[PDB]
């Protein structure tokens, strides 16, 4: 293998896709970034480490720019009003086989599949009701 | 409408699907658990709070258990050998429109799509390289 | 360019080869881990550091597990019955040219070459006689 | 039978091979030294000992000299400008069968095989990148 | 893609070119050294850190040695008579787009182009006047 | 000689070039500036001094304006969001001949030549990977 490659982060159906490409590997922390100024880029980072004697932890972070009314290539302030931050921590016990980890991945994709509660709530600026 | 519905967390193609259902909303934390004993159940929780004056934060948690039957005091009990924990926090500025939020959702699903770097690493007990 | 990649740790003639893959590179310590359960994985680490004004020192470590299944109270867990620990330190003065370093590597390979005293002693649970 | 014999430490394709020969086996430490001036000789030592109730430990050491002539006051002396020191410790539990030990040896050979990360880093005065 | 590649640091027109190659990435500092002993090698290092909340800073260092052979204790050692040190720090705001950054790069190469004031002064052990 | 002259800092191929011209010589510190308001100008400064008993030091500074979305001749705030700062310190031992200094200059131009790692990283808003 060699998983450190470019990938489509946002699939808008071929036209208007957001591709994210490797941009840093300092300290074993893989970073991917879209082709934008760093204040307006989609950014993804990932790293793994043995957190305890019994667990391994994947720390995955994603930053997504607020696009509506954005001044392309401009200076939009405050920065915090223009970005969303995702923080994922996946703790997997050292006994988990590859099959177990495949299942963990499916659970994650199931959680976020279109039509399911969590993603529809987020997309509608809502909570659960 | 009411987005608090049951959904399939793990899609094993119709046979052996792990489906999770609404089970509690006490204290503003929406919960879903699989049809198992509380000791062996998959669990998903989700809550939203206005963290800052200009941010909203979603806290989502998923527990994937490794089921087993344990003999305690000469008696067999349905138990979980171990559990994997997904912990995600998503901070979204209040200025994000619905279209801005759909972008976040798409980024999250693109991140975990089969074949992309991150899910490939996780499924192989590997880091990114 | 990159030497922090996947490689074959144990050549079993193409089938049953133990491949070790990059997992983490935190604090100057490169780590490789074989696939499947981290509990039963082979492990290799390497770090280089200037030990003195005139010497650089490599610290390489390898762990070879004895795969086994632990059964406690009816619960099975993939574990390593035990592990052999290889720990090596190589000091090389800063005056060493690339040619000197190639010779050093050859000495290490020759030391462990099949048929020679040391590897044959180890392979037979023996000392020198 | 005897494994305390002469062997080729550095294979230079038949010509200019560094051969190391038995020199002393006092106090459980087998020592091999290359020919000519002891001051410019390669050195290899090996000793095995029961480190704990369940482990045996091998201590192997190699010295690779950088041959040179020292000239002080008009007097020439064959010396080693400097030496690289390889020092390795291998712990193997007493439960290891011969097959387990053969695997351990293969892991060491694979670790240092030409082309793999570690040997290529050393040979190029480099670390991992 | 992977931008961590070897490059020619000093272009002496094909004959006597000083080419520098990737040699370490420990601690997030990318390093490149020439094919020499560590004591006589050209060295280039580069690291990026998000210095402020709105800036990113590149720290680049180059070491150009003046090679010599020194007699220490009657023995000849490859050494560096002296070294020249280039030390550059580049602070770029996060609002800079890729086209903004290309401007910085062009300015840096224009600054050092043959015939321009600065490189002329340096090459003549002169100041600007 | 008399190196204090106008020069092309940014070569955009004849059309759209940024020429920088002498603008100050207070304290022997040569300053060059483009034809813009000082908040939007490209600025270069250079000075030399004997830093220690054994070294001379050239301190070179370059400021580059963020151009994308810039309000020509306007007031863009904060100033720090609209400028990049380069700081170069070149330490050259007093033994360096003109030839040595020519080599030091080549090393600098080689470091920044198009296609080489450092400049491509900067231009792509990236680190090394």
From Swiss-Prot, chains A, B, C, D, E, F:
Q: Which UniProt keywords apply?
A: Capsid protein, RNA-binding, T=3 icosahedral capsid protein, Translation regulation, Virion
Subcellular location(s): the record lists: Virion
GO terms, biological process: negative regulation of viral translation; regulation of translation
Q: Is the Hydrolase keyword given for this protein?
A: no
Keyword RNA-binding part of the UniProt annotation = yes
- GO CC annotation terms, alphabetical: T=3 icosahedral viral capsid
Query: Segment Viral RNA-binding: which positions?
Result: 31-104
By its UniProt entry, which InterPro entries does this protein fall under?
Levivir_coat, Phage_RNA-type_capsid
**Which domain of life does the UniProt lineage start with?**
Viruses
Q: Which GO terms describe its molecular function?
A: identical protein binding; RNA binding; structural molecule activity
Q: What does this protein do?
A: Capsid protein self-assembles to form an icosahedral capsid with a T=3 symmetry, about 26 nm in diameter, and consisting of 89 capsid proteins dimers (178 capsid proteins). Involved in viral genome encapsidation through the interaction between a capsid protein dimer and the multiple packaging signals present in the RNA genome. The capsid also contains 1 copy of the A2 maturation protein. Acts as a translational repressor of viral replicase synthesis late in infection. This latter function is the result of capsid protein interaction with an RNA hairpin which contains the replicase ribosome-binding site.
What family does the database annotate? Belongs to the Leviviricetes capsid protein family.
> Which proteins does it associate with, and in what oligomeric form?
Homodimer. The capsid proteins form dimers that assemble by group of 5. Twelve such pentamers are linked together with free dimers. The homodimers binds to the viral RNA via an operator hairpin, but also to many other RNA sequences in the viral genome; this interaction probably shifts the virus from the replicative to the assembly phase and ensures specific encapsidation of the viral genome.
Q: What is this protein called?
A: Capsid protein
| Organism of provenance | Escherichia phage MS2 (Bacteriophage MS2)
Organism ancestry: Viruses, Riboviria, Orthornavirae, Lenarviricota, Leviviricetes
